[PDB]
Amino acid sequence: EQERLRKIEERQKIRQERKEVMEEQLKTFKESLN
Amino acid sequence: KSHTLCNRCGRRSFHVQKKTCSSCGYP
Amino acid sequence: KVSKSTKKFQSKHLKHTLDQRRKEKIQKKRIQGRRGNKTDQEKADAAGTREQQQLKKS
Amino acid sequence: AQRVTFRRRNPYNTRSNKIKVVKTPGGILRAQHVKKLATRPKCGDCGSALQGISTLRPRQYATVSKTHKTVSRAYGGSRCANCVKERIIRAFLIEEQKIVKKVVKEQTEAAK
Amino acid sequence: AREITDIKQFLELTRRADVKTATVKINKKLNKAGKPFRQTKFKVRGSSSLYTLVINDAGKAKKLIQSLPPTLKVNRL
RNA sequence: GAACGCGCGAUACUCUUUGAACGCACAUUGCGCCCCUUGGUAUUCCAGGGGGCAAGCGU
RNA sequence: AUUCCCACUGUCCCUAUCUACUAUCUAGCGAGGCUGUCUGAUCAGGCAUUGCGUAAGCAGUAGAGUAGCCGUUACGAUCUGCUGAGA
RNA sequence: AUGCCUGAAUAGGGUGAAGCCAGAGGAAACUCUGGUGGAGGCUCGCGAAUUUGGGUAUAGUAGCAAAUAUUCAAAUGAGAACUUUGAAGACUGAAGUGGGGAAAGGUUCCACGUCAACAGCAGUUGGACGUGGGUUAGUCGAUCCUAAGAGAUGGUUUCAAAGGCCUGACAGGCCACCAUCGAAAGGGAAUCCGGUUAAGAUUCCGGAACCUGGAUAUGGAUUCUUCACGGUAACGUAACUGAAUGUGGAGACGUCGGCGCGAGCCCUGGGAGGAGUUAUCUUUUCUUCUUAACAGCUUAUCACCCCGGAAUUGGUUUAUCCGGAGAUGGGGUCUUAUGGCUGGAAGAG
Ligand SMILES: [Zn+2]
DSSP: OHHHHHHHHHHHHHHHHHHHHHHHHHHHHHHHHO | OOEEEOTTTOSEEEETTTTEETTTOOO | OOOHHHHHHHHHTHHHHHHHHHHHHHHHHHHHSOSSOOOHHHHHHHHOOHHHHHHHHO | OOOOOOSSSOOSOOSSOOEEEEEOTTSOEEEEEOOOOOOOOBOTTTOOBOTTOOOOOGGGGGGSOGGGSOOSSTTTTTSOHHHHHHHHHHHHHHHHHHHHHHHHHHHHTSOO | OEEOOOHHHHHHHHTSSSOOEEEEEEEEEEOTTSOEEEEEEEEEEOSSOEEEEEEOOHHHHHHHHHHSOTTSEEEEO
């Protein structure tokens, strides 16, 4: 059970990192648009 | 095989790495 | 059927590969319980940022 | 089930010497050294393989005709078609913009 | 080696100044219909190549043999 | 002084390859250039032989 | 790492036997069955550091099953008899 | 201890990470189930360690020299356990006790004669002794080039007068930048098959073929007289001038995984031969049935071009990637890697 937990919080960290980098990419492309 | 033939003296004293002779000092 | 590369590696490189694996395992086991072996990221996390350091000094 | 080896001085598995096995008219398996394959010429702007140009070794080009290593279009044998089209369009638009800038400048110092 | 399908080209090859000998080779071989036949190869070497003419017709081979120069050496098989 | 050969050096009981060693390299009998000449179809090619190559914004 | 429970053991009571190797001298010199595998298959054998009591053959209408018809070809493990036989 | 340049090697078994597909629960986030996918400080056979070649930096006693299995007949010879032939038994078992190479060795290769010494018994044997024979290249290497680095010139291009070329019925002009060494595993123009000796082979012989350099001749083209055409296009061609100057490609470049294709080997059916076994059974067990470099015709995934304008979103890989920055669809262009037919070539084997 503890292993499955630590796995799901690892998934949480990975998804948050990917979402953050995607949002940053969109934000930095917005400036280059104009 | 640290030494080879020396042209000036004919001995097996020509150091291949140093390119110098330990018997007649060539060149 | 065994491949040629497998035969060559097992005839040539297996012994020293196994020995190095054993040595690495032994060293890791020995330094697992020692105190003072940390990664650079962990050292930075323990150190904290600048603002955390003025907070600690206060 | 007959074993063959190199036929030249190099005894090592280097890219220079590579071996194929063929059955000779004598009924035996023998080794044959294979040369390096040729590389298609590439466009000088985008790096894609040029179309309609023969793929040969560097010294084998001197023994074929010009139609086997060129294309009848301008820059043929050096640049592909899309790169040439882009060059033409860009040059024309640059010249037109130069004309427009010169006219605007002639207007703006025409005030004094 | 080169193959030629032209009879007059072969005759022109055999008519040059530097011609040594012509070889006539016979092969007993079967065709796709299954009936065996006689195939004749006329070989002459030019400057740097050996030109071969393959004829699967008996009468044409006989006519070409009769049309060869009388001062030309011919190897039978 | 050394190497290879028949005391001597292809003229071998004139002086090969070298060596302070000298066209350049060199643990290779490797790579050049210049002048004359000869031969093989020959103005072009190829080869052999001989002999060589360590000016000024000054007065 | 230590201590108790059960089971086993030549550790021991208490030694004994076999195989291999070794040691010695001489010539010269000289400080019946089973597993795996192979002989084309049976039969009969080889190898795997002993690898770990009913013969071969024939017959039966008895015989798991394979293979012919809607009383019936053939093959056939196993079993029974020749057979306390064979060696 | 830390390096640098150029090569070889970085294998296998197991497990199964992101991502993706189809389902179920939930308003999302998400969480389970099956598959797919094939990743790692995953496993298996301040410290230590971290494959490898070449180059290059900072008493007749101890004992028998230890690698198992030998036996029978014949030959030679003065002499045979040790030499030779045949038969039997046994061994290496493609990761060899089998065939080659770099380095290194230098005649140890082959033949004839011999056993004084040597091969720790013997020997008629020999990697021994004595005498001879043997190594053949335009295509294989070196030779050429540069790598790390080394090293002249006045420390490696530096307050150096450092060199070549061009024009013109001696003057003018152009350009910049340093020798050389350093790899028989890096880059590189080109040869294959068959046969042949006591000992030589991609080198010799026979046949067949390519590469580079050079001088030249002929045909054809260069179409009114002067450097050619076709297709919308990708592009095609028997040609189809091109100085200074400025560029581009090949050479020329990390490692791993699955998928597709070709070739060699392995497996296998029929048939044409030869060999073995057969008291009984066994259409049975073994072996031959091959096609070189080179050359002509033809043959492509990818990529690109033209038409066209797509949501009811389609196409599509084992791997979820692609499309108004133009998909699906229809029709074309190209590289010839690699197959097929043919010549070489059946005359060979
Ligand atoms: Zn391009």
